[PDB]
Amino acid sequence: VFNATRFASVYAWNRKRISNCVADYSVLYNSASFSTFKCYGVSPTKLN
Amino acid sequence: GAISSVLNDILSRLDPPEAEVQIDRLITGRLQSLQTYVTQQLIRAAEIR
Amino acid sequence: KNKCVNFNFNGLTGTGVLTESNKKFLPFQQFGRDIADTTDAVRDPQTL
Amino acid sequence: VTDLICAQKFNGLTVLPPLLTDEMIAQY
Numbered sequence: 492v493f494n495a496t497r498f499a500s501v502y503a504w505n506r507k508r509i510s511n512c513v514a515d516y517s518v519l520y521n522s523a524s525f526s527t528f529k530c531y532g533v534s535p536t537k538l539n
Numbered sequence: 540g541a542i543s544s545v546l547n548d549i550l551s552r553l554d555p556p557e558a559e560v561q562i563d564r565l566i567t568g569r570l571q572s573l574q575t576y577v578t579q580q581l582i583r584a585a586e587i588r
Numbered sequence: 589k590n591k592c593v594n595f596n597f598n599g600l601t602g603t604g605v606l607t608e609s610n611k612k613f614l615p616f617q618q619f620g621r622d623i624a625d626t627t628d629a630v631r632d633p634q635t636l
Numbered sequence: 637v638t639d640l641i642c643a644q645k646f647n648g649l650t651v652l653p654p655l656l657t658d659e660m661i662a663q664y
Contacts, residue, residue, distance in 0.1 A: 534554045544625075547601045623643045 493525075515539060540564040597630045 492507055499505040516538040519528050528535065541564040543549060549561045589606045598618070609629050611620070620629035641651060 533552055534557075537551055545600075545602075548599075551599065551601065623640065624647050 540568070595630070598633055600627065600630075602627065 492509065516535075519525060520535055530538070541549070541561045542553070543561075544565070546562060546565070549558050552558075553561055589608065592603065592605050594601065594603055595606055600619070611629060613620070613629075613631065618631045619627055622628040644651060
């Protein structure tokens with residue numbers, strides 16, 4: 492979803508399902524790997 | 540006008556400065572509901588008296 | 589159960605006395621409501 | 637002339653009993 496080899500185009504964009512699995516979004520803010528991260532519908536600290 | 544009527548959901552969802560805004564909307568409306576109730580009971584108390 | 593506790597089911601947290609319910613909810617229903625439209629009953633997600 | 641009462645008290649709506657009960661009213 493994030494580290495895939497090639498993403499789709501913005502003109503023809505694809506959708507992927509995430510369900511019935513554990514997701515720890517704390518890495519997206521603590522790890523200095525991705526450029527920018529900002530949540531709007533929920534606080535970034537209460538994702539888990 | 541708040542995002543939700545449950546106060547526990549606001550604090551556990553919104554940021555600290557954003558949660559105070561959503562909770563303040565409830566305090567404004569819920570208070571006016573009491574001000575309307577106490578006004579009717581006070582007048583109704585005078586009518587029954 | 590049978591004690592005033594701070595519960596948290598599906599992220600919905602609150603204060604109340606948990607106890608086994610005599611209500612028969614359909615297979616899809618999760619939460620119930622009282623006259624005041626506030627949470628009256630709950631469904632434990634792990635062990636239904 | 638005519639739980640519900642418990643749901644109101646849980647919401648902070650306290651229904652206090654009258655001081656002069658119906659039995660006290662009947663004897664007056």
